[PDB]
């Protein structure tokens, strides 16, 4: 199967630069042109750049022309996107995509998150939420930047989970996650949610223990 894995996303100061990479697998890289597309918080999609399969050509939209540069290394099956002179306006989720045949973007990367702001990294505070079935939860408060991922019991608990979109609370993000289980499971067994905030290399496990 065609696969495009991205990496390099992060928070950068306005004016700073950032290099995003996309690793292709599952096809003859050099036989296909490639593109980068971004999606701003307003959920709108915006084409950012494309490069020929050989790399003999590359063009961009006026919004980034002169600041962004697309590159590819067919020898290492990688696509790149160098961003310089970054602006707050550039904060978005960035995706790489393959161009087919006619020609269309049939395959996309998982997306890299880029945040351009003067705010510095702030790790989260993780608090356990303890009260037929039972619902437990985790409060992930005051962090920056997005995102964070949450897991329950290292990923074992995968169903009956609800992780809510983060919300800005005074320059800082907060979100919570809930998991519903049969009374049989809790408190009999131990339930712990796993919170990870890459930006701050933070990694914590909070156990859900009953009170009193």
């Amino acid at each position: 199967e065609v696969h495009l894995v991205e990496s390099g996303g992060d928070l950068v100061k306005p004016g700073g630069s950032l290099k995003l990479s996309c690793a292709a697998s599952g096809f003859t890289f050099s036989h296909y042109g490639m593109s980068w597309v971004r999606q701003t918080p307003d959920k709108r999609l915006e084409w950012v750049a494309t490069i020929g399969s050989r790399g003999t050509y590359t063009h961009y939209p006026d919004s980034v022309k002169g600041r962004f540069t697309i590159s590819r290394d067919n020898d290492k099956n990688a696509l790149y996107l160098q961003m310089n002179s970054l602006k707050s306006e550039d904060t978005a989720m960035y995706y790489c995509a393959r161009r087919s045949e006619y020609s269309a973007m049939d395959y996309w990367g998982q997306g890299a998150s880029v945040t351009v702001s003067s705010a510095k990294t702030t790790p989260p505070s993780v608090y356990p939420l303890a009260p037929s079935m039972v619902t437990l939860g985790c409060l992930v408060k005051g962090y920056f930047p997005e995102p964070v991922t949450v897991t329950w019991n290292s990923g074992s608990l995968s169903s009956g989970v609800h992780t809510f979109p983060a919300v800005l609370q005074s320059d800082l993000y907060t979100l919570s996650s809930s998991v519903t289980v049969p009374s049989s499971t809790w408190p009999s067994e131990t339930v712990t949610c796993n919170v990870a905030h890459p930006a701050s290399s933070t990694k914590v496990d909070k156990k859900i223990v009953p009170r009193d």
Binding site: V37, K43, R44, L45, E46, W47, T50, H59, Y60, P61, D62, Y95, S100, Y102, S103, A104, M105, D106, Y107, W108, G109, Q110, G111, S125, Y127, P128, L129, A130, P131, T135, G137, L139, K141, H162, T163, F164, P165, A166, V167, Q169, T174, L175, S176, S178, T180, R211
Partner: protein, 212 residues
């Protein structure tokens, strides 16, 4: 610069029905018109290209048509797994552009939320903070109001709400409401209540606890 306009913005359709989304191009496109499907947490996926060809892997359920300026995507039968963001795209010429995006929501029977209220954990209290959390899970329709009451009196400040996208299994919604207070405020009152008032039952579902 060609401009694409999709309509409607949001579309709610019962299971089995036909889904019709439209997109109008401000200029010719000759037939460089494609449609993409984007589900939460995922990158956009190619649905239809050249306005009528389904992407390799796309089920027969989908199909697009039209010509000239405007085209449209048609899903039939609409299934539980269809709620998402749908966008049309123009590749006729640089810069490539996307429609504003249209959200497809499935329609189902009303469903009352399962409500759970959580007191501030001891950890947060030790640091001078007090967040009271309330989850309203698996309800429908999406519009629902949450009201917090402290010692019987409604609280307005310090409330952050967050809704999840529609469930792709039971087609329900879930929501989180957080009332953040200061430890000192928290210690001054005893009863805390979370109230969910809908429309499919103007009789509230309540949940509360006593600090003591």
């Amino acid at each position: 610069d060609i401009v694409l306009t999709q309509s409607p913005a949001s579309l709610a359709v019962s299971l089995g029905q036909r889904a019709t989304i439209s997109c109008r191009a401000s200029e010719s496109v000759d037939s460089f018109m494609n449609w993409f499907q984007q589900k939460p947490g995922q990158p956009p996926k190619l649905l239809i290209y050249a306005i009528s060809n389904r992407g390799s892997g796309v089920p027969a359920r989908f199909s697009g048509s039209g010509s000239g300026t405007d085209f449209s995507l048609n899903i039939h039968p609409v299934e539980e797994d269809d709620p998402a963001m749908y966008f049309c795209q123009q590749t006729k010429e640089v810069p490539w552009t996307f429609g504003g995006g249209t959200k497809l929501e499935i329609k189902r029977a009303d469903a009352a939320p399962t409500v759970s209220i959580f007191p501030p954990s001891s950890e947060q209290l030790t640091s001078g903070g007090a967040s009271v959390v309330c989850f309203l899970n698996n309800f429908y329709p999406k519009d629902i109001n949450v009201k917090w009451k402290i010692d019987g009196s409604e609280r307005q400040n310090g409330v952050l709400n967050s809704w999840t996208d529609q469930d792709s299994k039971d087609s329900t919604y879930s929501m989180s409401s957080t009332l953040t207070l200061t430890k000192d405020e928290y210690e001054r009152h005893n009863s805390y209540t979370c109230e969910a008032t809908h429309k499919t039952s103007t009789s509230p579902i309540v949940k509360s606890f006593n600090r003591n």
